Design a protein around this ligand. Structure first.
Ligand SMILES: *[C@@H]1O[C@H](CO)[C@@H](O[C@@H]2O[C@H](CO)[C@@H](O)[C@H](O)[C@H]2NC(C)=O)[C@H](O)[C@H]1NC(C)=O
Ligand SMILES: *[C@@H]1O[C@H](CO)[C@@H](O)[C@H](O)[C@H]1NC(C)=O
Ligand SMILES: *[C@@H]1O[C@H](CO)[C@@H](O)[C@H](O)[C@H]1NC(C)=O
Ligand SMILES: *[C@@H]1O[C@H](CO)[C@@H](O)[C@H](O)[C@H]1NC(C)=O
Ligand SMILES: *[C@@H]1O[C@H](CO)[C@@H](O)[C@H](O)[C@H]1NC(C)=O
Ligand SMILES: [Ca+2]
Lengths: 320, 172, 320, 172, 172, 317
């Protein structure tokens, strides 16, 4: 029995199983997770000049719906949209609704510019309705004007308005067209004659004839006001020749800068910081991968079809 | 395993050892002891730290929304999006599984290699004064007190001090 | 002392730092780059039959804008488009413009086939304009004809013209619709009647009505000539039914073969060869990756978000 | 490293050795010399040449322009292209990093292995006529002239020619 | 090779050996034998099986058509799909080429290592009763019959039985 | 003099070349393919409730073209279109044709719901034609009705039918407009009165005015249009004659795999991956048959072969 020295290595009782190139049940001493499964149910907004719209819908704040009074202008780096958001108090739909919505959510602020659209004595520029309630009473969209005749019954005059883009950047201009759903309502507001609404810039052109038919009643209104939009470039005009029916703009919007567009139901939290978001909330994690959702925004871990992927942090566990 | 030490000629690990990853166990006239090896334990942990620094990491790319949560998307482009997102997800799932598998394979063998390197370093020190057990041990053919043992563990054991004595014990 | 033999490896004084799986500052004896950082600010066109369109927009070749008189026909394997290139002298736009542009920039040549269209006494088919100047005088799109009534005020006759594709490959037929600036101009040119323009083939059906209304002057012109296009297959006929408003084709196009389309401001250099191009120029690297631009065309290295990735081509450097 | 020679029991590299990657230094009565091993050097070089032939390459895939440089792309489809390109670039950036990091790790350890294979080839060639110094050298226990040292390098060393003398000196 | 045995210190393989991947060939007074080593053969096969199980596999992701076979698509969106599909095909082509090349490298070296781990296991068994041939063989310095040879293969060889005889034969 | 024991490894006479990270021509003892090159030219429909449409185009399924009669309703987990498949017995096209076709191939079955549309005594809704031949005789689209006047000269009555959506799911409704080339043809059919058609509903609403080469020996055309009727919504068609009317409307149930191929059927073989040329029933991870596939598939690669090593370096004697 000579003197002996033995080389050896450590081990553990609670060894973890990992996958290797050759072995699917390889036991190592320690390991750590690479796919994140936990998610906070709260929009982490520390170090972020954010804007929670809440009731308001992104399109809404260009036209000026009652719900978007707080959000008509302002600058931000993040913009949060909620479910079932009110874009239209008076019923109707925007053509290229989705393109408009994306461009607003992509922006980092809104500035309003006045059109300077004056109207004659025979026109009633301050027309209102019971659908869009502001301060508990009849009203209309803030950034538009419902143009009807002053005397009930008479014809609407052939007037023409024109906005000049004096700014060095592009402006977004919007306008509605009243589809009245009644020949009685069409005549006593606008006139008996056939109405024609023409729009035209250097880059855009279109003609609009108000169709009339009994549409289903929503918000207590059978008629419709369908909106259309375009971008007026720097140094360009845009004309609005109309013989009644038009809802012209009093103000035009300028989407300024860049910002993150988040769609989620979860609430704000201004104590926590994060850079990855999704419908269910925030993903504040150091890990490279995740299995919460494929639809995320900002600086995110990559989505993988894996519950777990264990990365070995130690040698083979060989117990006695 | 690749280097043949861990889960190899060393038949098992030592659960008793908690101040190191690799180390020594001796037996001489004075009795049984045990000590960690710092240099080899750190080489392994440092290499593993580097992996964690490189992998525990996300890209800095700002991805924006191309699918709406609260509304319908156009049908043709949504199919192009769905096809694309699914394809990207198959890539990342595959890249993640390959990465982790490859690193685990490398981690295990790297650790096995540090065990061997420590064994080979001790073997070469003891020179002609000891003989390999086959189970990761060295039978030393002279009186090796706790200072001699410490001198093996600390890479200061001089073979020529005990050579004449040990060569006679071996030949016998 | 006994005779000794010592095994060893080389080293160098100043080594090179690379990244491994486990170490970000690993010194090795030699390394080489895998990400190309440098670009030639030139379009390397050696061994390529190329066409620099210059001031000509690729669509302008098809309709024959004055700018594209040297580019009405041709063949090439590479086609080079430039900034602020001119498609439209008289103002307007093409429907599916970017689809058409991309289709032209994908071709390897244009041929022209006469359509042979003829018109009555009452139609004036040589109506030029000040917006499109050619040889110091008023002119028009070389491959189209402006059809207008010869007697001012008179109704344009319900005319019918048909092109059969006699060739064995598909032909690209283009036509314009004029959109007048007022009810005065519309009546002067095409008369007081309701205008309709129908274009029909086996594979194509569409109706067009000239929208009329006030809008800004582009190139001193309030009116717009918008363009349309389709493919007419071998043997198939395409018929134009029109009573004023049609800008009728006098020629149709055939897109021949395949070519690489480049959009760049960089000048041509016929001394260097390349298979990769971007806005800023050519990329002649043999390297696998590249950090110049994500927008590239041809056989390119893959864009990566990295300054440098050094590939070890030598052992660890352990200096004396 | 993995194989324990380079940055291991070989203390350092030789800046003087400039006609090879791996080689020999010897000392004897006649003086000092140096020489490079051709076969082991080219083995390491050829493997690195092989890496470069595979990695220094682009795909022969023609790609066309889907984004216009000089005109406004449709907003919805342009977001899809922006999202897609950024996803592809993250994959290729990640892949490039993983490619080089892994290859760099393999190259280093490959070169280490060729140092060890040369050392082991010399050890087995010398047999019982030498003893491992522990720093990559072999203390040869007989008169080994330049021609004897040349036969160790050229793999024609006959151990039985010097065995009688060498065993007597080793045991003493 | 990384571990220096297969296509290394062992000249070549044995087309004769069909009952396993690794094994032994001996010569003694009474004649000649051959036998496979099960443990090292199975360790190699098992490791290659795990690769095949991981690699020979496809994703369970449902992919619907985005390109009509019998009709035209819009030329812009068609080009966006063509760009995306070619980009994804370049990724998978590259990923496949890398995967296979990397695994082939790993398999070759893994198999090399198992040969070396078997060899080192025998070296330690025989201890001072044998010496390394250089060509993957052990010149045993005592009478070793077929039961002795079987004990070396089955790992029941006790060196002390033959130590007194062997050291004398080694020394003179 | 001394005994010998020798360690070694197996070899084979016929090795296989593979590519490694360092070596392009590396010979090993055994290898296996990872890229599938072989393609079965047969649609593998084992375990699949499938509908081979054959001569029928998916649009034509919804309007009832003579070639589609056997496919007007069903349930399936797979749908197979063919080349040159007939959609229209009387010439024309759908308003948003290729958008509709892909919606049908995305679905896993069709069930038709009767609209229950009655018309007056003067009008005659059974307008047959020599173009759409059925049962060896003059006929029309099965799911639509050709509305002409019973008096060959008399003017068409301004009729309006309505359809409320009873079911909880969305109902797909299709209609159109008949135009002859000349005016003289139009006047005898539906009266001299310059009539028009307008369909109105919850979301959808548009007016259409009856405005080339001839197809299937017919002078006039039938231009089709479509929209999804919402659940609990009323589609009312307002017309003054000369507009074909839906007798039934379609309902798409669930989803299924829309295959497009020229290759014939085989219910002995099974598969999860399909392409124009046929089926891909391979266990291998990659594939070089087509970039266009559907289902759960091996990934397309620009590679004829990729050989994965399944054994050691081959070192012969
Ligand atoms: C998208 O790519 C496909 C495949 O490269 C193109 O289809 C080819 O087009 C022409 C015929 O028009 C021929 O080269 C081949 O017959 C087609 N190939 C196949 C596989 O069908 C297609 O043209 C491309 N699309 C666009 C919009 O450019
Ligand atoms: C895209 O995927 C989502 C989630 O699987 C699905 O609900 C949706 O129907 C798909 N979109 C289209 C247009 O088919
Ligand atoms: C897409 O990205 C480019 C380059 O980063 C940017 O200039 C452009 O604004 C983006 N386009 C859209 C439509 O978001
Ligand atoms: C290898 O070197 C030895 C020793 O100097 C020499 O004698 C021999 O000739 C060399 N081998 C060959 C093949 O030349
Ligand atoms: C190669 O390995 C496979 C298993 O992957 C086996 O089925 C096949 O028979 C082997 N090939 C040869 C030629 O032995
Ligand atoms: Ca193309």
């Amino acid at each position: 029995d000579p003197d002996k020295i033995c080389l050896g290595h450590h081990a553990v009782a609670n060894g973890t199983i990992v996958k290797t190139l050759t072995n699917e049940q390889e036991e190592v001493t320690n390991a750590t997770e690479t796919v994140e499964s936990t998610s906070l149910n709260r929009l982490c907004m520390k170090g972020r000049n954010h804007k929670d719209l809440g009731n308001c819908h992104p399109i809404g704040m260009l036209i000026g719906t009652p719900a978007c009074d707080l959000h008509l202008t302002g600058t931000w780096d993040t913009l949060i949209e909620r479910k079932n958001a009110i874009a239209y108090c008076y019923p109707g739909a925007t053509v290229n609704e989705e393109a408009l919505r994306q461009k607003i959510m992509e922006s980092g602020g809104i500035s309003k510019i006045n059109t300077g659209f004056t109207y004659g004595s025979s026109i009633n520029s301050a027309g209102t309705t019971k659908a869009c309630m502001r301060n508990g009473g009849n009203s209309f969209y803030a950034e538009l004007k419902w143009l009807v005749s002053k005397n009930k019954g008479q014809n609407f005059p052939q007037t023409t308005n024109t906005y000049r883009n004096a700014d060095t950047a592009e402006h977004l201009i919007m306008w509605g067209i009243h589809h009245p759903s009644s020949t009685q309502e069409k005549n006593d507001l606008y006139g008996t004659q056939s109405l024609s609404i023409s729009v035209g810039s250097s880059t855009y052109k279109n003609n609009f004839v108000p169709v009339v038919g009994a549409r289903p009643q929503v918000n207590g209104q059978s008629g419709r006001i369908d909106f259309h939009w375009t971008l007026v470039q720097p140094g360009d005009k845009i004309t609005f020749s109309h013989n009644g029916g038009l809802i012209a703009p009093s103000r035009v919007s300028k989407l300024i800068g860049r910002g993150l567009g988040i769609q989620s139901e979860a609430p704000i939290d201004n104590s926590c910081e994060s850079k990855c978001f999704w419908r269910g909330g925030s993903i504040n994690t150091r890990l490279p991968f995740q299995n919460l959702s494929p639809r995320t925004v900002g600086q995110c871990p990559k989505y993988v079809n894996k519950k777990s992927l264990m990365l070995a942090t130690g040698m083979r566990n060989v117990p006695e | 395993g690749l280097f043949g030490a861990i889960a190899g000629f060393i038949e098992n690990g030592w659960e008793g050892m908690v101040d190191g990853w690799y180390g020594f166990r001796h037996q001489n006239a004075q009795g049984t002891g045990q000590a960690a090896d710092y240099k080899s334990t750190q080489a392994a942990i440092d290499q593993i730290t580097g992996k964690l620094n490189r992998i525990i990491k996300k890209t800095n790319t700002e991805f924006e929304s191309i699918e709406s949560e609260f509304s319908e998307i156009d049908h043709q482009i949504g199919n192009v999006i769905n096809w694309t997102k699914d394809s990207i997800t198959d890539i990342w799932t595959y890249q993640a599984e390959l990465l982790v598998a490859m690193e685990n394979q490398h981690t295990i063998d790297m650790a096995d290699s540090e065990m061997l390197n420590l064994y080979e370093r001790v073997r070469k020190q003891l020179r002609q004064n000891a003989e390999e057990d086959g189970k990761g041990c060295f039978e030393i053919y002279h009186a090796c007190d706790d200072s001699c043992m410490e001198s093996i563990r600390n890479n200061t054991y001089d073979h020529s001090q005990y050579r004449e004595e040990a060569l006679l014990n071996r030949l016998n």
